[PDB]
Amino acid sequence: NEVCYERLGCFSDDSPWAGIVERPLKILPWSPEKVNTRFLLYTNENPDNFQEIVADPSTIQSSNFNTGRKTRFIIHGFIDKGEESWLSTMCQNMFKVESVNCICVDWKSGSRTAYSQASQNVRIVGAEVAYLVGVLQSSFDYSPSNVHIIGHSLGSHAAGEAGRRTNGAVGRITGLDPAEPCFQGTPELVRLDPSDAQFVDVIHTDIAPFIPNLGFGMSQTAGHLDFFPNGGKEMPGCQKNVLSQIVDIDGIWQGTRDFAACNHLRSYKYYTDSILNPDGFAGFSCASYSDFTANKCFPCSSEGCPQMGHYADRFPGRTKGVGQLFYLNTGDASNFARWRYRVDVTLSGKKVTGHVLVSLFGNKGNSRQYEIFQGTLKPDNTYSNEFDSDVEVGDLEKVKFIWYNNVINLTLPKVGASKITVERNDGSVFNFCSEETVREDVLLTLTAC
Ligand SMILES: [Ca+2]
Numbered sequence: 001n002e003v004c005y006e007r008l009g010c011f012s013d014d015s016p017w018a019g020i021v022e023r024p025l026k027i028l029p030w031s032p033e034k035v036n037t038r039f040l041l042y043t044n045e046n047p048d049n050f051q052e053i054v055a056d057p058s059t060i061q062s063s064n065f066n067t068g069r070k071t072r073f074i075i076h077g078f079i080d081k082g083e084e085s086w087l088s089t090m091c092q093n094m095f096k097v098e099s100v101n102c103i104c105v106d107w108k109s110g111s112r113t114a115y116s117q118a119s120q121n122v123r124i125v126g127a128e129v130a131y132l133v134g135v136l137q138s139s140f141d142y143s144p145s146n147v148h149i150i151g152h153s154l155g156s157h158a159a160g161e162a163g164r165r166t167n168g169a170v171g172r173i174t175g176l177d178p179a180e181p182c183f184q185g186t187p188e189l190v191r192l193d194p195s196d197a198q199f200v201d202v203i204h205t206d207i208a209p210f211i212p213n214l215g216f217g218m219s220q221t222a223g224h225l226d227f228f229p230n231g232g233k234e235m236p237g238c239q240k241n242v243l244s245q246i247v248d249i250d251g252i253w254q255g256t257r258d259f260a261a262c263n264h265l266r267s268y269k270y271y272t273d274s275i276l277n278p279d280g281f282a283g284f285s286c287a288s289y290s291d292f293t294a295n296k297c298f299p300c301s302s303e304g305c306p307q308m309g310h311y312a313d314r315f316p317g318r319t320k321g322v323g324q325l326f327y328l329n330t331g332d333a334s335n336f337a338r339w340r341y342r343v344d345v346t347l348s349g350k351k352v353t354g355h356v357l358v359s360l361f362g363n364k365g366n367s368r369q370y371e372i373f374q375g376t377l378k379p380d381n382t383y384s385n386e387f388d389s390d391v392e393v394g395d396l397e398k399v400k401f402i403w404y405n406n407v408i409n410l411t412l413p414k415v416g417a418s419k420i421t422v423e424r425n426d427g428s429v430f431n432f433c434s435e436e437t438v439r440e441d442v443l444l445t446l447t448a449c
Pocket of ligand 1: 189191193
């Protein structure tokens with residue numbers, strides 16, 4: 001079956017658009033007016049309330065749109081209860097750091113229906129954005145490379161459809177946890193993939209299988225840069241979904257079935273905080289998350305780490321390959337920014353059993369106390385660990401140490417640290433040394449050496 005409409009052209013259910021193992025049902029997208037895609041423009045001069053615009057030169061000229069600055073589109077997918085302002089508060093953070101035309105793409109009418117119909121309706125939203133990018137190009141001489149499309153969930157595949165219709169001339173697409181059911185494993189034609197824009201960066205936060213783990217995000221790679229914060233399967237601060245061999249996808253998408261959406265929504269929460277924290281999301285190249293947590297992928301590669309989120313386009317080798325892997329951990333609640341450090345402590349004093357905590361003091365602040373090791377504390381040994389600090393301390397000026405003994409022992413054993421070496425994520429190393437040994441619950445300051 002094939003339908004054709006004015007402005008947007010024809011759409012058919014021919015394979016691969018339908019009737020293949022990943023998306024079996026033959027159904028067509030609704031018509032444009034039933035999807036009712038809307039373009040809600042916020043700018044630095046109108047940051048709180050939008051100006052509704054349409055692909056018409058006079059309407060664009062009458063708005064606050066300005067051809068001398070970049071344009072970022074934000075396209076939604078699943079909207080959970082109480083999350084309906086996420087698109088405009090993502091635009092409101094950008095106005096704090098840059099001048100931008102920020103356009104929220106509302107297609108609530110075309111998404112609030114069965115999941116397989118919404119998957120098809122993504123094609124209409126795609127076609128509509130390409131059509132406005134086209135008008136900006138022909139009427140204002142505004143190059144597609146000045147536009148960035150950000151799409152979350154099912155919306156990241158509408159972003160891909162737009163990029164595909166602009167022949168990949170679009171400057172950047174960010175996929176925030178691209179939805180998996182009806183898309184993973186399909187041809188590039190049907191999903192978000194690196195040929196859709198000049199640079200595509202993807203953030204993975206709910207990648208466990210939909211059947212039966214109910215992870216709505218693809219595990220499959222889809223950008224030049226693929227980020228897996230916290231491993232991409234379980235996000236800190238979020239509830240987990242119970243396993244189900246058969247699942248009710250329409251009830252889930254339509255909000256009538258129970259589904260913990262925390263994991264899937266974290267992708268745009270991290271992107272919103274990245275805007276205001278330009279170095280708070282360093283991604284490390286690493287072959288896997290287990291190597292990362294085994295402390296095998298620190299410090300950053302010499303040309304710098306990519307920042308996951310808003311600043312990933314500053315990364316020097318961003319298009320040297322597709323599917324480049326980066327891992328990192330985030331906080332469990334907002335500000336989600338974390339800064340990783342590696343600490344090596346050499347213990348002096350007696351043998352004991354307990355845990356050793358360390359705190360960093362620099363010119364920009366000091367951190368919490370983190371546990372480096374728990375177990376038998378052998379003198380002369382070195383114990384190392386990497387932790388994600390919620391404070392960036394700056395240039396280190398001192399470090400502090402404390403230990404706790406996990407037994408009843410009134411000998412009063414003393415334990416100290418002869419050297420503590422701190423490495424930042426740029427590879428800079430600071431050494432601190434001590435002559436002292438101390439009883440438990442006593443804080444030892446170490447000066448540089
Ligand atoms: Ca594509």
